[PDB]
Structure formats: C-alpha cells, structure tokens
Amino acid sequence: ERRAVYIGALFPMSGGWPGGQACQPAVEMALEDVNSRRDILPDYELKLIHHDSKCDPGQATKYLYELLYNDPIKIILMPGCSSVSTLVAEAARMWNLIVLSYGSSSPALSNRQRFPTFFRTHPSATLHNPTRVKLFEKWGWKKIATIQQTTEVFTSTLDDLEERVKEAGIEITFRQSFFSDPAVPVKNLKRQDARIIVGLFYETEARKVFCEVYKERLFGKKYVWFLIGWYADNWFKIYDPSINCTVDEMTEAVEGHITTEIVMLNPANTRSISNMTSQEFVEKLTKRLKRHPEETGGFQEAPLAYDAIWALALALNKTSRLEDFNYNNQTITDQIYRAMNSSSFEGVSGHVVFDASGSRMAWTLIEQLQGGSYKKIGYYDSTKDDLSWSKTDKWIGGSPPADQTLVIKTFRFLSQKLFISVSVLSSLGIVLAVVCLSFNIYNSHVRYIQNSQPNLNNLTAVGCSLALAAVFPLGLDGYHIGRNQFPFVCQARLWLLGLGFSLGYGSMFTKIWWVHTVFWKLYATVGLLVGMDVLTLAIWQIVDPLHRTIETFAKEEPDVSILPQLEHCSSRKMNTWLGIFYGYKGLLLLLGIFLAYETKSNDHRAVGMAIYNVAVLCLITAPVTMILSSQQDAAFAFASLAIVFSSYITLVVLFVPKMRRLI
Amino acid sequence: ERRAVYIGALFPMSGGWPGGQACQPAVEMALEDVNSRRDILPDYELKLIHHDSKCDPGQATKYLYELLYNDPIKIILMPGCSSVSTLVAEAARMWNLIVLSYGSSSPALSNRQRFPTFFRTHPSATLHNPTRVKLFEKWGWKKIATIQQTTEVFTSTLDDLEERVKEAGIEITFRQSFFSDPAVPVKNLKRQDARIIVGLFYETEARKVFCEVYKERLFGKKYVWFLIGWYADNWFKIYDPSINCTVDEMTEAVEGHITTEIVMLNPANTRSISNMTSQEFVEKLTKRLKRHPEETGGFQEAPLAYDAIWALALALNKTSRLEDFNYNNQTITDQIYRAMNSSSFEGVSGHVVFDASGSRMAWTLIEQLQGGSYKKIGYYDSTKDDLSWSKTDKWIGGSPPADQTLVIKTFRFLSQKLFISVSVLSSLGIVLAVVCLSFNIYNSHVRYIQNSQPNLNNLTAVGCSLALAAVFPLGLDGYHIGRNQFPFVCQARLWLLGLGFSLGYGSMFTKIWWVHTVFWKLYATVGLLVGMDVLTLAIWQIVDPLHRTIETFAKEEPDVSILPQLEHCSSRKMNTWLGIFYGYKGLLLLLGIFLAYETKSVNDHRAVGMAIYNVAVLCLITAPVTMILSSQQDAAFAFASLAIVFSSYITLVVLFVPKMRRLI
Numbered sequence A: 001e002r003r004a005v006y007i008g009a010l011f012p013m014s015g016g017w018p019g020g021q022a023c024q025p026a027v028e029m030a031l032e033d034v035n036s037r038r039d040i041l042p043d044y045e046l047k048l049i050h051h052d053s054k055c056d057p058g059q060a061t062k063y064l065y066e067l068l069y070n071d072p073i074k075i076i077l078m079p080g081c082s083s084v085s086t087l088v089a090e091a092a093r094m095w096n097l098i099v100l101s102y103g104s105s106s107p108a109l110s111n112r113q114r115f116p117t118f119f120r121t122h123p124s125a126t127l128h129n130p131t132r133v134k135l136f137e138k139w140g141w142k143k144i145a146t147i148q149q150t151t152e153v154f155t156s157t158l159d160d161l162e163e164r165v166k167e168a169g170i171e172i173t174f175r176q177s178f179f180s181d182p183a184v185p186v187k188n189l190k191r192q193d194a195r196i197i198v199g200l201f202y203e204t205e206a207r208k209v210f211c212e213v214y215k216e217r218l219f220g221k222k223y224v225w226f227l228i229g230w231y232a233d234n235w236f237k238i239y240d241p242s243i244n245c246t247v248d249e250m251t252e253a254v255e256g257h258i259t260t261e262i263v264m265l266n267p268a269n270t271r272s273i274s275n276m277t278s279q280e281f282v283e284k285l286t287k288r289l290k291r292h293p294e295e296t297g298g299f300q301e302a303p304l305a306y307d308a309i310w311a312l313a314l315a316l317n318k319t320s321r322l323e324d325f326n327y328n329n330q331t332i333t334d335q336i337y338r339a340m341n342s343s344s345f346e347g348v349s350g351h352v353v354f355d356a357s358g359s360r361m362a363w364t365l366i367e368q369l370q371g372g373s374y375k376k377i378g379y380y381d382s383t384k385d386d387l388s389w390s391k392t393d394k395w396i397g398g399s400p401p402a403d404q405t406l407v408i409k410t411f412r413f414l415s416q417k418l419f420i421s422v423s424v425l426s427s428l429g430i431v432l433a434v435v436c437l438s439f440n441i442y443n444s445h446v447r448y449i450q451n452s453q454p455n456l457n458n459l460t461a462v463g464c465s466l467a468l469a470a471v472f473p474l475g476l477d478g479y480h481i482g483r484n485q486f487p488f489v490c491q492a493r494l495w496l497l498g499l500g501f502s503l504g505y506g507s508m509f510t511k512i513w514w515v516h517t518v519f520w521k522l523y524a525t526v527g528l529l530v531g532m533d534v535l536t537l538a539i540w541q542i543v544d545p546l547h548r549t550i551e552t553f554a555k556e557e558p559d560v561s562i563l564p565q566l567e568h569c570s571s572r573k574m575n576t577w578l579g580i581f582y583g584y585k586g587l588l589l590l591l592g593i594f595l596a597y598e599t600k601s602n603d604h605r606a607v608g609m610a611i612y613n614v615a616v617l618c619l620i621t622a623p624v625t626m627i628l629s630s631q632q633d634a635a636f637a638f639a640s641l642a643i644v645f646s647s648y649i650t651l652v653v654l655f656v657p658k659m660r661r662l663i
Numbered sequence B: 001e002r003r004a005v006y007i008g009a010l011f012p013m014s015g016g017w018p019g020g021q022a023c024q025p026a027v028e029m030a031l032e033d034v035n036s037r038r039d040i041l042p043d044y045e046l047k048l049i050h051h052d053s054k055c056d057p058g059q060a061t062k063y064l065y066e067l068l069y070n071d072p073i074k075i076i077l078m079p080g081c082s083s084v085s086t087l088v089a090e091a092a093r094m095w096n097l098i099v100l101s102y103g104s105s106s107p108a109l110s111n112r113q114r115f116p117t118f119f120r121t122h123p124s125a126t127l128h129n130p131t132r133v134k135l136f137e138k139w140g141w142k143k144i145a146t147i148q149q150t151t152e153v154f155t156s157t158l159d160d161l162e163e164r165v166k167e168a169g170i171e172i173t174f175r176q177s178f179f180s181d182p183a184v185p186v187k188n189l190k191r192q193d194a195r196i197i198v199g200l201f202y203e204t205e206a207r208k209v210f211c212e213v214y215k216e217r218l219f220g221k222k223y224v225w226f227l228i229g230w231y232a233d234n235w236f237k238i239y240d241p242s243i244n245c246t247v248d249e250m251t252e253a254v255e256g257h258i259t260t261e262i263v264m265l266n267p268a269n270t271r272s273i274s275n276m277t278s279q280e281f282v283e284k285l286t287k288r289l290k291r292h293p294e295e296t297g298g299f300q301e302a303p304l305a306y307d308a309i310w311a312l313a314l315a316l317n318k319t320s321r322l323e324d325f326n327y328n329n330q331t332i333t334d335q336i337y338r339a340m341n342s343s344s345f346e347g348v349s350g351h352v353v354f355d356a357s358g359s360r361m362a363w364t365l366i367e368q369l370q371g372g373s374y375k376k377i378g379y380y381d382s383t384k385d386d387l388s389w390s391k392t393d394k395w396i397g398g399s400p401p402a403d404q405t406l407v408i409k410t411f412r413f414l415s416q417k418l419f420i421s422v423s424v425l426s427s428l429g430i431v432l433a434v435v436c437l438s439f440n441i442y443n444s445h446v447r448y449i450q451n452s453q454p455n456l457n458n459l460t461a462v463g464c465s466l467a468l469a470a471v472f473p474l475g476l477d478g479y480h481i482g483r484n485q486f487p488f489v490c491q492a493r494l495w496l497l498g499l500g501f502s503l504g505y506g507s508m509f510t511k512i513w514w515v516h517t518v519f520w521k522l523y524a525t526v527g528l529l530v531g532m533d534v535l536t537l538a539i540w541q542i543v544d545p546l547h548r549t550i551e552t553f554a555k556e557e558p559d560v561s562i563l564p565q566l567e568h569c570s571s572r573k574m575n576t577w578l579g580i581f582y583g584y585k586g587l588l589l590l591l592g593i594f595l596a597y598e599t600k601s602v603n604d605h606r607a608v609g610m611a612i613y614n615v616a617v618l619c620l621i622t623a624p625v626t627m628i629l630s631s632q633q634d635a636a637f638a639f640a641s642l643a644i645v646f647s648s649y650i651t652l653v654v655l656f657v658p659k660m661r662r663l664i
C-alpha cells in the first residue's frame, strides 16, 4: 500500500482571473503522470483537495480553514490568485506549511519577511523591467515617463523599475498614477513633453486612456508606448462606450507600441522530465476541456501548474518522513524549503530555477504592433543577458525617437548677398580714391592744383580708402572667419575706422582751422589729430580690449530646437569707450561745421558741404549701429552704407572738379 | 442567571500602530459600565475573548479562527488595525458575523460589496478631504498638487480627493508617488510650479521629504503645505540620518503647514450615555494603564472603542434571541445590522452616527505650525458645513498665496521726459516759423524779399510748422489718450506729416525747377504735389486705414508675470503702403537734389539747395530706421522727432535768417 499524501489547492473558477478552468485539469494530469512513474514517490501517493476561491479572499479563507482545520493533514498549499496566495503565504508560517502559488504575479510576494514559505512557478511582474532597461540602453533613452493604474501589482512594479533604472544610467522624468481619470495624466505627458511612455494598466483602462491620447494627439513618430502583453490580440477593435473614439481613431493611436510579456511555454521541442513536449502537452490538455482554449481561462498558465506540482514531487523526493508531519514541526518544512530552493529542471514552461525570493526567472518576450497586427521581435533573459533579436521593429522614420528635443546652437550670419554688394562698392570706392590720388599727384604743376593743398587732400583720400576697406572686416563673423583669427578682424575694424576717419576729417578740418586763423603749419594739426586718435585707441585696447562674445536669443525654431547665437566681439566697458570716442568725434564734427559756416567766404570752400554731410551721416549712423547691435544684416548695412557714401561723396566732391576743370 | 454573550476581539499590542495597550482597558471599562446597568441587557451579559494581532494579518487569521472554530460561539468581532479589519470584514459574511472596528481608518472599508457587515467608530481618512476643499474654496485655489507615500490608505485618499475636487470647482495640476525616496517629486513641484501641496506620508517620510524641500528651497511665502496631524508634536526636532539637514534647516522648512486631524474626544463637558465626560473618562482610564499616556499606544483611539461597545450594546438591546446564534443564520445579523445603522447617541467620542458605508462622520480640527508650535484653527463638519474659525492663521505676506503667478498686461510708454523736451523743441520751432512768416509778410515790397518767391517760402514755413506739430501725436500711446481717440491720433500723425512734408519739399522743388528753366506756373506744381499727396493718402485711408494693433513680447521682468504690450497702430498692408510712399518720396528727394546740383550756378537758390540736400539725407537715413525700430519706443520716436525738428529748424533758418540779417 502507498502512504497517501494530500495537498491543498485553491483554483479560481471565476473572478478577475479565471485560471482554474485550465489549471485544475493540468494539475490532475501532472498528478497522474507523477504517480504513474514508479521512480519518484514509490512509497507515497499524491492526492489533491480542491476548493474554489473566485480569486476572492473572502471565499478563500473560509475554504482555507475548511481544508486546514479538518483532516486529512496537508503538506503544501497551491493558491493561484495573487490575493489568496498573499493571504495564504502570510498565514502559513503560523501552521508550518509550504505554499506553491502556480498563478500569482505580485512583486510583494518576493519578500521573505512576510512570505518565508512561498514559492511560485509564475514569474513576477517586475520581470518585465530587466527587459525594458535592457531595451532602453539599446536605444539610449535616459528620460522617461511612467503612468500606472491603481492596483495591487502596478504599484510595486514601478518601484522596482525606478530601483533598476537608477543603476542603469537612466532616470525618470514624470510619473502619475490615475485612479479612474487618465486625462490630466495625458495632459501632463503633453506638457512635460515625454516622448517615451510606460503604460501599466488593464485592457479597460487602456481603451480609456488611448481614446484620450488620440484626443490629445500624443502619438506618432515622437512618442513611444510600452505596455504589457496580457491584453488579448485585437483589443482596440472592441466596444468602448466610455471611449468616445472609434476603431479608426484608436488603431492609429496604438500604432507601433512595444509590449513586453513573459513566455509560459518552451518553444523548443526537446522532451522534459515527463517525457513530453509543449506541442504534445497542449493537445493532451485541450482533450480534457469541456470548453475551448479561447474560452477556457488560464490556458497560458497551465504549464506553470504542471511544473509546480512536478517541482513539488521532485523536492519531495529528495526528502522522501512525511506520514508524520504535523502543523507544529518547523523541520520537515525546512527540509522541503532547502529542497525547493535547489529545484532545477526542464519542464513544459522551461528551466525552473527558484531565486531566493521564491519566484522563478524566465524568458521575457517582446512584441510591437505593426498595422493592427502584433509582430514578435525578441526575447531577453535577465539571467545571462541573452537577447535574441529578430530585426522586425518597423519604426516611422526607419529609426526610433529619443528622450527630448535636441537644442542645436545655431549661428546667425549676414545675408551674404549684402556683404558682396557692400564689398564691391567699397572696392570701387578704393579704385576711385586711388585714381583721384594719382590725378592729384600728376597735378603737381597746375595752379588750381598747386593752390589747393594737395598734401591734405591726399590724406583725405587715404583715410577714405582705409574706411572703405573697413567694410569687409565688418561682416566677417564666422561664415568666413574662425575663433582663432577672429580678434584680428575685430581689431582691424577698429584701427581702420579710427585712422581712416581721423585723417579724412583732420585734413578737411585743419584746412578750415587755417582758413579761420588765416581769415606749413597745417601739417602740425593734420598729424596731431591722427596722434590723438592712435593714442586713445591704444589706451582703449590696453585698458579694455576687444574679445569675442556670443549673444544668445530666445530659443525657438519651427524635431530639434535651434537656439540662435550672435557672434559679437565686444569688450566689458565697451559702451563707455564707444560713447567717449563718439562724443569726441561729435564735438570735432560740430566744431568743423561751425568753422565752415563761419569761414564760408583753394578748393577749401567746397569741402564744407562734404564736412557737413559726413557729419550728419556719422551722427545719425553711430547711435543707430549702437542700437541695432542685436540685429545682423541691418547694423552692418547702415555702417557700410554710411562709410561708402561718405567716401564716394568726399572724393567726387573735392577731387572730381579738379579734373573737370583741368580736363 | 444571565445568558452570557461573547465578543471576539483582536487588539494590536505591537506593530506600526500599537493601539491595544489603551483600547483593551477601555473595552473592559465599557463592559463593566454596560453590565453594571440593569436597563440595557438585563437578561444577557457581555464578555470578551481577546487575542493579540500585532497589526499583522498572519498573526491575525490564526487567532481569528482559533476564536471562530472554537467555542464559545461569538456574535461579533472587534478588530483594530486596518489590515486585520480588511481581512476579517471580508471573511465574515461567510460566517454571518458583524465586524465593529474601533481603529481602522482605511477608505477601502467604506465599501458594502466586499464589507457588507462592517461598522467602525474610527472615521475614515477621506474625512480630511471635505475639510480641505472647504479650506480651498475659501482661499480660492483651483490648482493644487499632491504626493503620496506608498501605503494601503493614502492610495485611496487622493482618489476620494479627486472625486471631491472635480465636483467642487477645483482641478488638480500634479501628482506623484514617493515610494522610497522623494527626489523627483519635489523637483517637478519646482518645475511644474506647484505652490499648493497636499502631502500624505508617515513621520519618517515627512522628515525625509522636508530635508529635500529645504535642499530645493521649495518653501516660503509662495508655497503652502497640507499634511495630516497624526504626527506627534515636535517631530521635526528628531534625529534624521538620511535627512542630512537639521532642526535649524527643517524648522524653517515646515513653517506654516496646515495639519487637519480628526477629533476623537468631545471637548464639551456634557455627560454621555454612561453618565461620564471626557476629563473624567481620561482620568479613569489613565488610572488603569501601567505606563504613561505619552508612552502608551492608542491613547487617542480609546474613546472610539468605548463608544463602539456602547453602540453595540444599544443596537443589541433593541434586538434583545441571541443565546441561539449560529454561524449559518443570516437573519439575526440583519436585525443587528438594521439596529446598528440606526445608532445615534452621544458618547465620549461625540455623536455616534453610522453612514451607509458603516463609517461615522466627525469633527476635523485644523492646525497650523507657528514657530515650532501647533496653533489650532477652526474645526469643520462634512455634514452641517459648520466651520468655526479662531482667526489664528498667520501667513507671511499678511495673506495666503494662490495657485500660480498672475499674468499682468503691461503697456510700455515713452520715457515721458523725452516727450517733454522734444515737445518744447517743436513748439519753439513753430514759434520760429511764425516769426519768420510774419517778417516775410511785412517786408513783401523790398527787393531783397521780393526776389525770393514769398508765396512759396510761406508754404515751406507752413509745412515745417505742420511737421513740427506732428511731433505731439507721435508720442501719444495711452499715457495721454484712450482707445477711442487713439485712431484720431494715428490719423493726425499721417496727415500732418504728409501735408507738411509736401508743402515743404514740393514747394522748394518746384521753385528749383522754376529757377532751372532759367538755366503762376510755379503755383501749378506747388499745388499738384500736395494734391497727389492728398489723393494717395485718401486712397490709403479708404482701402487700408490705420487701426490700433498691439505687439506682445516675451514674458519677463520677474510673483507677477509681466506680459508686455506695445500700443501700435499700423494697417494690415501698413508695410506695403509705407514702403510705397517712402520710395516715391525718395525718388522725389533724389530728383530735387539732382535738379539742385545742376542748378548750382544760376534769390534764395543755394540756400534752398542746401536745405533740400540736408532734409533729403536726414529723411532717407531716418525713415527705414523708424521702420526697423517699430518694436522699440523711445528710440524710433526719438529719431523721428529729432529729424523733424532739425529739418524744420534748418529749412527755416537757412532761408529766413539771411533775409532779416540783410533787411535790418
């Protein structure tokens, strides 16, 4: 005779998860297969005492104590629902019992302080998370947003996920759990601009949140969505009275969302401990269901029950000492615990290895929605990092997005059609100045050319030419210069402007000063002006010299955000030096024009109109430029136009008539 | 004899909430007081069968069934913790038992589908939320924030709070879930700008999150913090290993945080069903505790046990039929249920009424931290809406902040000192023009003044005067005008400028053409210019007239957020018409200066020519400037006004000063 052995079991034949329909037949098949074998428990015989629980802890504790405070005496319990398993595991160390939940996937059952006798063949839900991070590091996403329904599972899953992301060079950006309304969740996902979402919720919360993401147009090539694989295929094509949207409005919202689930069946065909395979066990089972698989609940979680009872039989074989087990002996349970901890074998679900938490690790699966059809992608094992991709992820732009918009620092440059025009004009001006200088030099014998002070009109021409040349450097801002030779340009601007204007006005101003005092000493002042200019410029460049500075405008650009930067070479006390120099030159302009109005009565009376014109131009242009600093292509426009027009006018005024009369 | 009646109970003497230490003595006192009375249950006698539970659902179901599958037969259960109460209350309909919890504050127990036999003398935690809304609506806060520890309570409290805020003219603006360490919670409260926070967490979580709110400088006059008042007084002055901060860095971070907590004791002195009061019941109890109250556990939740057993005895007196109670009869339990829901009486804890969810309502007492001291504030009742202020809320800014930063619309105006100086200058210019006109009119016979066309110099002066007048409308942007007269100004600007510049430059240019003929025919062109100007201006005002347009710049200048506005008036095609007009007038300027350069040899000719050249260069360098500086006041107007005034001054002096200097 065989010493009978009993095991309590609680099978949910109804409720949120009806997984007893397909997991009672599996347990019975496994009992038959383990008792037919005469090498496992030949001295004993396993027997089952089933009770319904409805995945309800009220129906559950009643039957638990009906099967606990009654004979026969049990050696183990098998609760499937997370709630019943949680209650049973917590309230078993008080009876010295082992609990072997074949269908509970609550991370809270991985704790050994409350659940010191708990083992399960059903992987936890945290086991999606080793995958997600090992799916972010691939695509390198460090900024993440998470949303979670309020359930007894998803509350711990994101905790595990944060703990696992911290140690993965990744961080979270947004998280908000909705009890019943996901709208403000999506509203903040749109406000915070989270392009990567991790959606933990059941089918109904899904159909309720996707009819909100569509309403918020928060999908497409700039948004990714992770979910769970448990949702039945073709779940968005189902009535959703609370979802005001429609099939066509959702199928586009859930287009290309990733889905990490677990695999509860060895895709291999290699035999197992029971000399059976998956394709064979599925048939042997479906031959025992009064209903069909699609109508039989818990059909994907039957192999877990099979493997659980098989692991029980094994870990009970090593022990082999059981007919004398009472609810007060904390030693038989410890023997069975050390036998179950060391439980390694290949069952229908795969290789079962119970971690220290009691749970078992398994192979994660990954899918992606590709036109109303789920398309497997890859597998991942949190044990050996063995990631088996399949190159089937069809994104929108051939590659996946990233955390956030990239702020590219763009530089603003002149139109580059204005620069060419101003430069052509300045070159023509230099040509004209040289032509006039030559016509004057060659005119060293004529009277009108002899009377007109030529040694000062030549200086006027030289200064006008220098100023004209100052045009090209005024536009070099990166399109044609580098950060190394850039101070060269920012210094050439200053020196050319300074010296050119100094001479161009000193000649024509000493001429009027002489005309005044007189109605070869002119060279004295004609040189003293340039000397004061050189001295003040050197003092400026010694005290506060020019150096490159980048000015950043308001960041915006119509998936990158281009923040514009202007390359302005400016000193620290710049404005002060500019104001000082402009004030000195303005005093000088005003004195020159006053002396011109006073001394109106050779070739010195015409220079007065030129003086006044240059004066008004510079006076109206300097402050303009000082104000238009924040604008390129306009400040330079006025500066270059003022320079070139002053030059053209001065030259054609006080050099042209000479030839017009001498020609 | 008396037919004994038994009561199963589960008292937590250890765990997160050790509330059996002070609730077993209270139970026993209640049983003594309810059996010493011969007018409640004279045929019966209540007896207790207790078991410790440690607020542990493992140590709890063991004893539950040691007292369920054993004799004697129990008629009711009394669990204290919320885990234990959630475990029992769902495993009682299976035995047809009544569950009467004196210490469970979980909203999940206000459900009749899982817990149809459950009553509790301990109010739920949702009972804080009717207060909070009745404390937001007052201070007008439609945008709030939340964070929640991970517990079996706070998860449902914010659910109730959303359900109750939606239906009260309120809307949430943030939420999160501090599980292990609050770091992103506060960071997003700073980023999302949550100035109103509702933090539900246990003391450990508090001391852990406040050493982060400080580190983030997320407190002050612009932030308000709501909490629960269950934390013991002077709880921030305690060691905090993970909280690198200290009392000095926390006492300032928890300054002025509201702590709405329930009141478990009648502050009144009125007697109760037991002919006892609060100041007396507390003494009688403390005379039964081997430890000190502050050191004893569950000392504030004993009155609830007393009231619970009294309610049980009352609702069991009406029923009076109990010595034959089996676990399979679903009728005695229904009698006791209809007797318990109809239970109203004044006990130590107050008025003991049981809502449809089994729970009871009560009085929430508000508190606020004022210098390391909790300062009571008005109570509240979710039923009567009765709020009883004490007027002790000491805010920082003499008043409480609001949800966000009020965005004000700012109208930028001219310096208003520039305007005065420039107006003075334009007025002096008009005075000068009038003086010169009067002189030119008086000396109309002298050849020195008979040569210069006076019928045209008068027009030049009239135009200069009009242009000078155009300076005043150019600075009226609201500081001196309203939205009604503002188009009048945006029309006067146009007409004065146009007509004055016409009568000036057209007149001088026709005079130049006339003197060119040498190298009433002039009146013809001097009038045709102004006529074409009037025609084109009327076309513009009839097709695309000027209307006030506002320019909005980026918000800046920092709790008021200043939204800057620019009072402009430019038509839709304003740029097009302006460019057309400026191009035409520039062509005319160039033609005039060319005719002058050609007529430089052929009275008042060179003066007119120099004036033409100056006015031309000034207008040419000034118009596009003012067109680019549209987005800048005090600069565009500055250039425009200085140009107009200098053009007027010069065009007047150049050709009227020599006249008088020679005629003197």
Ligand SMILES: *[C@@H]1O[C@H](CO)[C@@H](O[C@@H]2O[C@H](CO)[C@@H](O)[C@H](O)[C@H]2NC(C)=O)[C@H](O)[C@H]1NC(C)=O
Binding pocket: A275, A276
């Ligand atoms: C497991 O099943 C396989 C196939 O059903 C068994 O392999 C057969 O064993 C029989 C012995 O009765 C042989 O006659 C056949 O030739 C085998 N077929 C093949 C394809 O190998 C195997 O023996 C079973 N394992 C056991 C019983 O331990």
Ligand SMILES: *[C@@H]1O[C@H](CO)[C@@H](O[C@@H]2O[C@H](CO)[C@@H](O)[C@H](O)[C@H]2NC(C)=O)[C@H](O)[C@H]1NC(C)=O
Binding pocket: B275
């Ligand atoms: C309730 O208690 C009060 C006082 O605690 C009782 O009133 C006293 O009654 C006694 C009778 O034993 C008198 O001697 C005292 O003079 C009363 N004192 C006061 C202040 O009234 C009252 O009788 C009690 N009610 C009951 C027992 O029903």
Ligand SMILES: C[C@H](NC[C@H](O)CP(=O)(O)Cc1ccccc1)c1ccc(Cl)c(Cl)c1
Binding pocket: A016, A017, A080, A081, A082, A083, A103, A104, A105, A106, A122, A153, A230, A231, A301
């Ligand atoms: C893989 C997992 N197996 C079943 C859990 O193990 C039962 P649970 O109690 O842990 C969570 C639970 C789930 C549904 C309804 C109530 C509860 C699972 C999860 C969701 C679904 Cl839809 C399916 Cl088909 C399968």
Ligand SMILES: C[C@H](NC[C@H](O)CP(=O)(O)Cc1ccccc1)c1ccc(Cl)c(Cl)c1
Binding pocket: B016, B017, B019, B080, B081, B082, B083, B103, B104, B105, B106, B122, B153, B202, B203, B230, B231, B301
């Ligand atoms: C008013 C309430 N009285 C006790 C609850 O009624 C027991 P609970 O189980 O419902 C929640 C619970 C509380 C603490 C530790 C574990 C659990 C209460 C709430 C918070 C605190 Cl910190 C305290 Cl001291 C007291």
Ligand SMILES: *[C@@H]1O[C@H](CO)[C@@H](O)[C@H](O)[C@H]1NC(C)=O
Binding pocket: A039, A040, A314, A317, A318, A320
């Ligand atoms: C059962 O235990 C026996 C030892 O008595 C053994 O040798 C056999 O391999 C066991 N069956 C297994 C491990 O499947």
Ligand SMILES: *[C@@H]1O[C@H](CO)[C@@H](O)[C@H](O)[C@H]1NC(C)=O
Binding pocket: B337, B338, B341, B342, B355, B356, B357
């Ligand atoms: C009290 O309970 C009874 C049923 O026993 C029910 O009819 C009644 O509505 C309840 N009272 C309230 C206020 O819900």
Ligand SMILES: [Mg+2]
Binding pocket: A228, A229, A230, A231, A232, A233, A259, A261, A367, A374
């Ligand atoms: Mg799937």
Ligand SMILES: [Mg+2]
Binding pocket: B228, B229, B230, B231, B232, B233, B259, B261, B367, B374
């Ligand atoms: Mg308090």
